[PDB]
Amino acid sequence: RSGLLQRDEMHAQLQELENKILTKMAEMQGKSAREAAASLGQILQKEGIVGVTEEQVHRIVKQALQRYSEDRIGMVDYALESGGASVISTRCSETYETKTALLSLFGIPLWYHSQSPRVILQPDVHPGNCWAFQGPQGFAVVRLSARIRPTAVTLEHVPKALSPNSTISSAPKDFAIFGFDEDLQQEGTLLGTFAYDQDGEPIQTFYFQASKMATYQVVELRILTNWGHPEYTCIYRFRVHGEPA
């Protein structure tokens, strides 16, 4: 219409179509760039109407080929929502509603919206699927899917290349992990203090001191600092690993 970027109706399906394509691409990360484009042309020919150009599909493929970053984490995630874990709503920082204009797979700029604390327990970590709170300090409390002996923690953020302004300044920096013996404790035990490295890999794993046998089902992620973003901090995914009791 105007060509203006705005929260229009065209914006709706275009976002819906985008990460619908993305969840399909991971299945063909081991396929040729030529083979991938042919398949993508058929999911388009499964719902979309127009027979897309031969290279236009190929370009979406080339673009989608770096919305993928390797996930080598094979450990059980006891903070995974679909596994039975949940974010304790009343025990989280106030959700900060923020948005960023970024380029989608189709080249069209889209407003990407920040979500509820729930998404930090969700595997989808595409740009925007993160929970933001105001300032460099915040916290989220998670009830794990099972009572475990915590042994490690995994924190990930979007890659720099897909991040707003190609910097990662909104990523958490120094953080602490707390364990709560029950849901009725509100006297946390400090499991460990770490720092998410902005210059490191998107996915980073941190392990605790391996001699304390304390058992937990409730865990707090407390962000102490971020990587310089003066307005907010957002978390893409928080994982909790350990041994089942």
Q: Min. distance of Cβ 16 from Mg ion in angstroms? A: 17
Indicate the residue among 98 and 129 with the shorter CB distance to Mg ion. 129
Q: Min. distance of Cβ 6 from Mg ion in angstroms? A: 25
Of 127, 131, 129, the C-alpha closest to 140 is 131
Q: Min. distance of Cβ 113 from Mg ion in angstroms? A: 13
Q: Count residues near Mg ion (CB under 5 A).
A: 6
Indicate the residue among 127 and 179 with the shorter CB distance to Mg ion. 127
Q: Min. distance of Cβ 130 from Mg ion in angstroms? A: 6
- Judged by CB under 5 A, which stretch of 18-26, 71-79, 177-185, 228-236 contacts Mg ion? 228-236
- Side-chain-side CA neighbours of 62 within 13 Å: the count stands at 8
Long-range contacts, 98-102 (Cβ 8 Å, 24+):
98/132, 98/231, 98/232, 98/234, 100/127, 100/128, 100/164, 101/5, 102/127, 102/128, 102/162, 102/164
Q: Alpha-carbon dihedral of residues 52, 54, 57, 59, nearest 10 degrees? A: -130
Q: Does 237 bind Mg ion (CB under 5 A)?
A: yes
Q: Residues 101 to 130: which contact Mg ion by CB under 5 A?
A: 119, 122, 125, 129
State how far Cα 65 lies from the chain centre.
18
Q: Min. distance of Cβ 126 from Mg ion in angstroms? A: 8
Indicate the residue among 105 and 121 with the shorter CB distance to Mg ion. 121
Q: Could you give the C-alpha distances from 90 to 50, 53, 141, in angstroms and in order?
A: 47, 50, 9
Interface residues with Mg ion (CB under 5 A) are 119, 122, 125, 129, 236-237
